[PDB]
């Protein structure tokens, strides 16, 4: 039921709802969903991704959408700071995310 939204979900069902417009940047929402892509979802949440980590990962996708909408590189687009923890497990999450 595409409107819009997909659900990237962290740990004990902490569901981040990402607009289709951002989702498609993962091309991953656009493609990942398919097997049955044809259903009128726009609704996907995480089931393991910690929330504070997943939040930043999906915030990157939103940030990318904003950057794209902006087009001319920067119109009050902040520095995408990433504190730091790495890494040990984040490597695997990052690999799965595969920008």
């Amino acid at each position: 039921m595409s409107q819009d939204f997909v659900t990237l979900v962290s740990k004990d069902d902490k569901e981040y709802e990402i607009s289709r417009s951002a989702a498609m940047i993962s091309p991953t929402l656009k493609a990942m969903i398919e097997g049955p892509f044809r259903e009128s979802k726009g609704r996907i949440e995480l089931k393991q991704f910690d929330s504070h980590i997943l939040e930043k990962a999906v915030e990157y996708l939103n940030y990318n959408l904003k950057y794209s909408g902006v087009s001319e590189d920067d119109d009050e687009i902040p520095e995408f700071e990433i504190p730091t923890e790495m890494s040990l497990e984040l490597l695997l999450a990052a690999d799965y995310l595969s920008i």
Binding site: A31, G35, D95, L97, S98
Partner: protein, 297 residues
């Protein structure tokens, strides 16, 4: 190294590969085989690696061998039913590689970064020429084994169906504008997945000997027709049959491949002929007649 064991992350990875592509080969897939693939590649990778990754592309080829024997074990068979089998091979693995790579894309990035063509020709591993030991992703190996998959059933019945469909089954349904549309679209559609040869299989696989025997044969056509065709006119029946080949080839397209046969026999049939023709040129100047002289033009 001090990292961790890196040869214990590829054993189970290959197991999931065989229980996916071949598992739901042809039919769909579903989210079960989605995460089966995903945990497949994660076990091929979480081993917890380096040694998983090489063994990861190992089980990659292994269980893609599985899912594509789901798309190739049915090639020692009978008439175009298996041509349509190759069709369905492609067609199933369309959504196959679709959901496979969509749920598998990070490992697709991961297990390939040592031995492939785009990254590796001579530097830190080979994919540039050969080792018999590549490392590449799901549609990459898809096209790779696919071209090799393009041989057993191809040589078996698709060549013969080509055969029994390029001279003399013009009538009824040929073939119609989807048969050799799809077949010749196969020829162009198997061009280099590195995109190096975006047209080799068309000159090579479809386009040259059609100019060959269509030119020779169509000169046969213009010959017999000039035997028995009331020349008024010869130029005009020329215009008829040449348009015949134009629309016969407006069923099989195959684009560009065979016709770039079309340029090839017209110069045969009016470049090994002119004399009586360009003589027929001052006759209509002398006895008009807009149609005949026009077609001369």
């Amino acid at each position: 190294m001090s990292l961790k064991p890196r040869v214990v992350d590829f054993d189970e990875t290959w197991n999931k590969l065989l229980t996916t592509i071949k598992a739901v080969v042809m039919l769909e897939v579903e989210r079960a085989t989605w995460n089966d693939r995903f945990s497949d590649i994660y076990a091929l990778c979480v081993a917890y690696p380096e040694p998983l990754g090489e063994r990861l592309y190992t089980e990659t080829k292994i269980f893609l061998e599985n899912h594509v024997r789901h798309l190739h074990k049915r090639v020692l068979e009978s008439e175009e039913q298996v041509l349509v089998m190759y069709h369905r091979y492609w067609e199933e693995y369309s959504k196959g590689a679709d959901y496979m790579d969509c749920l598998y894309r990070y490992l697709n990035t991961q297990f390939i970064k040592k031995n492939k063509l785009t990254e590796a020709d001579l530097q830190y591993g080979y994919g540039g020429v050969d080792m018999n030991e590549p490392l590449m992703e799901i549609g990459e190996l898809a096209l790779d084994m696919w071209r090799k998959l393009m041989v057993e059933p191809l040589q078996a019945i698709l060549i013969r169906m080509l055969l029994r469909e390029i001279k003399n089954d013009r009538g009824g349904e040929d073939p119609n504008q989807k048969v050799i549309h799809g077949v010749i679209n196969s020829f162009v559609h198997v061009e280099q997945y590195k995109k190096k040869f975006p047209l080799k299989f068309y000159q090579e696989i479809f386009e040259s000997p059609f100019l060959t025997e269509t030119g020779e044969y169509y000169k046969q056509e213009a010959s017999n027709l000039l035997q028995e065709s009331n020349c008024s006119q010869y130029m005009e029946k020329v215009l008829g049959r040449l348009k015949d080949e134009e629309i016969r080839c407006r069923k099989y397209l195959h684009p560009s491949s065979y016709t770039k046969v079309i340029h090839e026999c017209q110069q045969r049939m009016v470049a090994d002929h002119l004399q009586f023709l360009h003589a027929e040129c001052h006759n209509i100047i002398r006895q008009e007649k807009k149609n005949d002289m026009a077609n001369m033009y």
